Amino acid sequence: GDFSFGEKNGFDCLLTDLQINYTLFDQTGKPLRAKLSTTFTSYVEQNRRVREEGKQSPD
Amino acid sequence: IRTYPPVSFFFEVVFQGENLDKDVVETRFQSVTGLSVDMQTETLKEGGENRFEHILPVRTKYDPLVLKRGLVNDSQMVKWCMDAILNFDIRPMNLLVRLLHIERSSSTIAPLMTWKVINAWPKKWSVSEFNAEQNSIAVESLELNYSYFETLK
């Protein structure tokens, strides 16, 4: 929605870690509750990275 | 078929021990309690069965035995207890607890119920408070550990 991480409104990422726990089951075996834990890492392209670092120098 | 239940105030205790079973003052008590047993369990839940869980038996526990009297100034039983407590020298004994009634066929005093208490040894000893302003009796109380009890069937 309206959340802001910083100067942007989204998080660009890749998944690195995931775990699922099944804690409740039906009488036929099908699950009724699952708990998930995830870890993501930040991703940004080369061309765009060098433009975000707008290096100003005696260059 | 029974119509009337038994009465609780006519009872006796016997020490099957060193030579205490023949001493008259060692059978007279004001109160006896602590004769109860309990089963301890754990709970296990099975996935997919949401209607009940499983209760599994673990071990058995017993309550201590508590006796109360008016203070007897010279008692062989108390010598036995204080030998256990002061000199760390214990020698367990067996006990009988009897509930009595009147039987006639003239009449006679007879046991109605009997429990055997196995391997008893001292746990605690106490005497009541001394108070200059109250009408009271010096009352001593003894608590014992034991292994288990059984009905003399």
Side-chain angles (χ1 to χ4, degrees):
Chain A
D2 272 352
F3 188 86
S4 178
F5 289 83
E7 63 185 342
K8 307 204 260 283
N9 276 108
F11 195 76
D12 291 323
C13 53
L14 298 162
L15 175 79
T16 80
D17 279 309
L18 169 69
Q19 179 172 307
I20 307 174
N21 287 97
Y22 298 99
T23 58
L24 199 76
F25 303 88
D26 186 18
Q27 81 181 1
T28 38
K30 291 174 65 175
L32 297 174
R33 185 159 296 156
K35 301 174 184 177
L36 301 93
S37 322
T38 65
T39 309
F40 296 92
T41 189
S42 181
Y43 181 89
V44 57
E45 91 180 26
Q46 180 181 0
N47 297 355
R48 184 171 180 157
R49 180 177 61 76
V50 299
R51 282 174 156 82
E52 285 172 349
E53 319 161 24
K55 292 166 136 40
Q56 297 164 6
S57 34
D59 313 327
Chain B
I1 297 169
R2 180 169 64 83
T3 306
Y4 295 95
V7 166
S8 93
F9 54 74
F10 196 30
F11 63 93
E12 202 196 349
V13 176
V14 178
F15 289 82
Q16 296 184 304
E18 306 189 347
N19 192 31
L20 299 174
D21 50 307
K22 293 180 178 69
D23 196 347
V24 168
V25 282
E26 304 297 339
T27 43
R28 298 175 177 178
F29 289 88
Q30 189 178 35
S31 183
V32 181
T33 194
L35 202 65
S36 44
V37 60
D38 183 39
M39 183 66 75
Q40 297 181 359
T41 189
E42 53 166 80
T43 298
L44 176 70
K45 180 176 177 66
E46 181 176 0
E49 177 60 81
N50 298 316
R51 198 196 212 101
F52 58 91
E53 40 199 352
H54 298 290
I55 307 300
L56 315 190
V58 177
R59 61 179 179 179
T60 300
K61 184 176 176 182
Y62 288 83
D63 279 347
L65 188 68
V66 182
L67 303 168
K68 292 189 179 181
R69 297 192 299 200
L71 185 70
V72 178
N73 63 345
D74 175 284
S75 323
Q76 299 300 317
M77 175 217 292
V78 176
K79 287 184 172 72
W80 168 77
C81 305
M82 292 305 160
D83 210 277
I85 291 168
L86 285 171
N87 293 299
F88 221 87
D89 179 7
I90 322 179
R91 303 179 301 270
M93 295 196 291
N94 296 327
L95 317 177
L96 298 175
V97 178
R98 292 173 175 166
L99 187 67
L100 308 171
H101 74 124
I102 302 298
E103 219 166 49
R104 56 159 320 112
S105 158
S106 300
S107 298
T108 189
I109 299 166
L112 179 62
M113 282 284 289
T114 303
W115 295 268
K116 302 184 295 188
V117 183
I118 291 164
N119 291 328
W121 52 279
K123 177 184 178 180
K124 183 177 179 182
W125 183 91
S126 295
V127 72
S128 64
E129 177 183 352
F130 300 160
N131 192 317
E133 298 185 1
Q134 298 182 335
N135 288 315
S136 318
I137 300 169
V139 176
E140 64 173 311
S141 90
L142 178 68
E143 302 190 7
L144 303 171
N145 292 307
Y146 61 91
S147 286
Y148 64 96
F149 66 87
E150 230 197 300
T151 309
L152 185 65
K153 264 152 22 162

